[PDB]
């Protein structure tokens, strides 16, 4: 249910402390409010790869505000899945790049052997919030929301959450913050790190047991870049800096 160090090693993946914390969490609602360059995309892609191989027949989506944004995590899952399939002889990968559809077929024997029968198919799709029409179906075991704070809450409440609750699927909800909107609320439901600047009501907030939240500024992950980030404030508006790098929740 959780990818292991052995699985990371297969992926050529060496997570950072914040990525590792996300991977170790068993919460069905993981909410990561992290600045740019925090490793959000890579960690989410690793989660998807693991599900497709470790849970044959699993179905998941990555949803972003736009298709170009969804292509980022989707494309990384593709590379990893097509490479990793080499060491699982009973799998065969099928890709539809145009439709952002990735299939991992699981067989009853190695694919190169006579008589191989397909037993299960894991499926991973990219989806766009700015195309609600293509949000139909589907029984999901997992979902990734990328730049979630820019996705309308209605996409979550109406088009994603109902299908997840069916199979008791999990959600990884990741974003740089965009003020005090639904992403802030979901973040607080899982925030147990106490009072922290940039997070209103931290320290006094309630939490829900199925929620776990993660927070990191860009310079928490890249301390050697802290001075460069700070020196950009000469030409970057203060709000943009506090949100995109500080990962701060600010009342617009
Ligand atoms: N554990 C890691 N080790 C090395 N590089 C990483 C790791 N995680 C992320 N990256 C790098 O950062 C990018 C992936 O996530 P990214 O988009 O930077 O983080 P965020 O989504 O938080 O902005 C890629 O450039 C990837 O090479
Ligand atoms: Mg990202």
């Amino acid at each position: 249910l959780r990818p292991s160090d052995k699985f990371f090693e297969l992926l050529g993946y060496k997570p950072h402390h914040v990525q590792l914390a996300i991977h170790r969490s068993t919460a069905k609602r993981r909410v990561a409010c992290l600045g740019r360059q925090s490793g959000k995309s890579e960690a989410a892609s690793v989660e998807a790869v693991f599900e497709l191989f470790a849970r044959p027949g699993s179905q998941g989506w990555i949803i972003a505000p736009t298709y170009d944004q969804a292509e980022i995590i989707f494309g990384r899952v593709v590379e990893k899945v097509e490479r990793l399939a080499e060491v699982f002889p009973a799998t065969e990968v099928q890709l539809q790049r145009r439709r952002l559809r990735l299939l991992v077929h699981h067989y009853d024997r190695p694919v190169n052997a006579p008589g191989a029968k397909r037993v299960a198919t894991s499926e991973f799709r990219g989806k766009s919030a700015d195309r609600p029409d293509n949000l139909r179906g589907a029984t999901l075991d997992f979902v990734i929301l990328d730049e979630a704070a820019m996705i309308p809450f209605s996409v979550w409440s109406e088009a994603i959450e109902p299908t997840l609750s069916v199979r008791d699927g999990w959600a990884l909800i990741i974003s740089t913050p965009k003020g005090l909107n639904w992403f802030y609320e979901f973040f607080l439901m899982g925030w147990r790190g106490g009072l922290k600047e940039g997070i209103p009501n931290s320290g006094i907030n309630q939490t829900h047991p199925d929620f776990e939240s993660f927070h990191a500024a860009s310079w928490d992950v890249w301390p050697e870049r802290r001075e460069w980030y700070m020196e950009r404030r000469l030409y970057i508006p203060d709000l943009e800096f506090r949100q995109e790098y500080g990962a701060e929740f600010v009342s617009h």
Side-chain angles (χ1 to χ4, degrees):
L1 51 314
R2 296 336 310 166
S4 59
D5 291 335
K6 307 244 272 175
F7 194 85
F8 295 154
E9 189 82 336
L10 286 175
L11 276 174
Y13 175 60
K14 289 107 177 140
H16 304 149
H17 63 287
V18 188
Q19 297 168 316
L20 194 55
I22 293 175
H23 296 311
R24 289 192 189 270
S25 172
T26 58
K28 299 240 169 54
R29 305 287 179 263
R30 289 174 289 175
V31 189
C33 175
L34 316 178
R36 299 182 176 182
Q37 306 184 340
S38 290
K40 289 177 309 291
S41 281
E42 198 70 9
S45 77
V46 172
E47 292 278 334
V49 176
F50 181 73
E51 289 287 329
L52 297 173
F53 285 100
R55 283 284 185 171
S58 61
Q59 294 183 137
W61 290 359
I62 180 269
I63 316 176
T66 61
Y67 270 121
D68 291 323
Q69 186 63 29
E71 285 168 24
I72 298 172
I73 290 173
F74 183 82
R76 297 181 188 205
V77 175
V78 172
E79 187 280 328
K80 296 177 162 50
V81 162
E82 282 178 355
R83 169 164 55 85
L84 212 70
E86 173 65 25
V87 301
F88 298 106
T91 68
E92 180 175 77
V93 180
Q94 190 188 350
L95 174 56
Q96 302 169 1
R97 275 190 204 276
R98 305 195 277 272
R99 288 183 278 186
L100 299 184
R101 199 189 182 201
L102 179 65
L103 301 177
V104 182
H105 302 294
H106 292 265
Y107 292 78
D108 73 337
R109 75 197 72 185
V111 177
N112 72 343
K117 275 179 195 64
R118 185 179 291 178
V119 178
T121 295
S122 310
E123 181 170 1
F124 184 67
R125 287 227 211 190
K127 293 295 185 183
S128 161
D130 66 13
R131 301 289 175 72
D133 294 346
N134 286 331
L135 297 178
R136 320 199 298 118
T139 46
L140 292 180
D141 304 287
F142 66 101
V143 63
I144 300 153
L145 277 69
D146 192 25
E147 273 303 293
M150 288 293 285
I151 295 173
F153 182 63
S154 58
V155 180
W156 169 261
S157 64
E158 300 174 2
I160 297 155
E161 190 277 338
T163 69
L164 266 191
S165 309
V166 173
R167 263 153 133 189
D168 198 36
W170 58 256
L172 177 58
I173 304 170
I174 61 182
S175 194
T176 63
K178 245 74 175 180
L180 308 178
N181 65 3
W182 77 275
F183 177 79
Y184 163 68
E185 301 171 348
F186 271 42
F187 176 87
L188 216 60
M189 288 171 192
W191 177 247
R192 301 181 179 76
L195 184 37
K196 264 189 58 48
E197 184 178 340
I199 305 172
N201 291 141
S202 56
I204 58 166
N205 62 290
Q206 282 133 300
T207 56
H208 299 189
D210 45 337
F211 279 74
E212 181 168 2
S213 296
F214 314 81
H215 188 243
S218 307
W219 54 78
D220 291 325
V221 188
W222 297 110
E224 71 270 31
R225 298 177 190 167
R226 190 182 195 279
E227 183 64 23
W228 177 79
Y229 293 131
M230 294 303 179
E231 292 184 14
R232 296 196 71 167
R233 295 178 294 174
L234 284 198
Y235 61 91
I236 285 181
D238 189 42
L239 185 148
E240 179 183 330
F241 170 90
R242 291 182 175 273
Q243 284 197 340
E244 302 304 318
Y245 300 117
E248 292 179 25
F249 290 103
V250 305
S251 60
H252 289 198

